[PDB]
């Protein structure tokens, strides 16, 4: 009876407590594999990520290298173009130097151009009066000319009537000479005839 | 009794031993599930330690992408703007070229027309040399044309002086002539008288 009955009383509080037990752990083992069930999946979501990001950084480090190629090449284009400016100005300083030593040339050539015209304008005004002057000592020319001309035929014909008066000067001369021959005979016969009137009236007185 | 008891008192010994048992392969079974869960904690640990360490460096490399890309901006404005210099510095030496290439034609006419014009006064003193040998001439000439005319005027003024005296010398030989012939009829007249009156006195000797 007392034996009995102290045993039952342990022999269903092991029953119990075994019930108890099973309870606890198929507790834990539930909640434990739901932990590892939690790690697991937030381990795995770290290795989609932990890839994710490798790659966006090497798009990055692309990313940026390609800049720095693009930034070394502008660089490049600007030094290109200052430099190729530089040029540009002193060939401006070259084009407006020989522009003013064009506009000194245009200068010198114009300013003797116009001596030349003012050379030329005295080289017609001294043509048309040397051949002025030249033409009238031309027009004097026969002026004079016809001068000796007239005086050519007066002299000319002068000399041909002092031809002629030495012509009647001789023949007058021939003839008052030769009367005097005729006046001397008859004047001898004059004489001649007073002498028969002198033998005449003188012998008369004579003879008887 | 002892029948009953015996068969519950094996029940006591076949109890304590089963949880015995079951609470060894109870710690057994939770120290394996802590340790797998204490795996994948560590798993996990050790990767987001190397996520942030490449979020860490993603950031570093983004800011070295933007540093870059500011730069390129920078590096493109001054370019273009100098570009836009170097545009405009051509476009004004197109037109410095231009000017030049008017400006060397007109100086290049220019020069040909001061060749024309020296050219015109080569000539224009060969005219004046042969035209002036003229005028010389000229005066060269009517010189001894009134040289010539002045000797002849005076050979006239002696011919024609001359010419006055030998008609002097004609009309007194013709006077001269008629007063002798005037003479003759006196002696002729006398010679008929002289012959009257020597016949009158014959014809009368012949009477008595």
Same mark, same amino acid.
């Given at each position: 009876?007392?034996?009995?009955?102290?045993?039952?009383?342990?022999?269903? !509080?092991?029953?119990?407590?075994?019930?108890?037990?099973?309870?606890?752990?198929?507790?834990?083992?539930? =909640?434990? *594999?739901? *932990?590892?069930?939690?790690?697991? &999946? *937030? =381990?795995?979501?770290?290795?989609?990520?932990?890839? +994710?990001?490798?790659?966006?950084?090497?798009?990055?480090? !692309?990313?940026? !290298?390609?800049?720095?190629?693009?930034?070394? +090449?502008?660089?490049?284009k600007l030094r290109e173009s200052q430099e190729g400016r530089e040029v540009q100005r002193q060939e401006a300083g070259e084009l407006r130097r020989s522009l003013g030593?064009?506009? &000194?040339?245009?200068?010198?050539?114009?300013?003797?151009?116009?001596?030349?015209?003012?050379?030329? &304008?005295?080289?017609?005004?001294e043509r048309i009066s040397l051949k002025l002057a030249n033409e009238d000592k031309e027009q &004097?020319?026969?002026?004079?000319?016809?001068?000796?001309?007239? $005086?050519?035929? +007066?002299?000319?014909?002068?000399?041909?009537?002092? *031809?002629? $008066?030495?012509?009647?000067?001789?023949?007058?001369?021939? +003839?008052?000479?030769?009367?005097?021959?005729?006046?001397?005979?008859?004047?001898?016969?004059?004489?001649?005839?007073?002498?028969?009137?002198?033998?005449?009236?003188?012998?008369?007185?004579?003879?008887?």
């Amino acid at each position: 009876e007392s034996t009995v009955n102290a045993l039952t009383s342990e022999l269903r !509080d092991l029953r119990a407590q075994r019930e108890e037990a099973a309870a606890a752990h198929a507790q834990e083992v539930r =909640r434990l *594999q739901e *932990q590892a069930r939690d790690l697991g &999946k *937030q =381990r795995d979501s770290c290795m989609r990520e932990a890839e +994710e990001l490798r790659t966006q950084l090497r798009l990055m480090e !692309d990313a940026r !290298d390609g800049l720095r190629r693009e930034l070394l +090449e502008a660089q490049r284009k600007l030094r290109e173009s200052q430099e190729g400016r530089e040029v540009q100005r002193q060939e401006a300083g070259e084009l407006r130097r020989s522009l003013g030593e064009g506009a &000194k040339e245009r200068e010198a050539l114009r300013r003797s151009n116009e001596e030349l015209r003012s050379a030329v &304008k005295k080289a017609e005004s001294e043509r048309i009066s040397l051949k002025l002057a030249n033409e009238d000592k031309e027009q &004097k020319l026969a002026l004079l000319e016809e001068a000796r001309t007239a $005086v050519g035929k +007066e002299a000319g014909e002068l000399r041909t009537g002092l *031809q002629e $008066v030495e012509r009647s000067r001789l023949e007058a001369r021939r +003839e008052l000479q030769e009367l005097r021959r005729q006046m001397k005979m008859l004047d001898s016969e004059n004489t001649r005839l007073g002498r028969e009137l002198a033998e005449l009236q003188g012998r008369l007185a004579l003879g008887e």
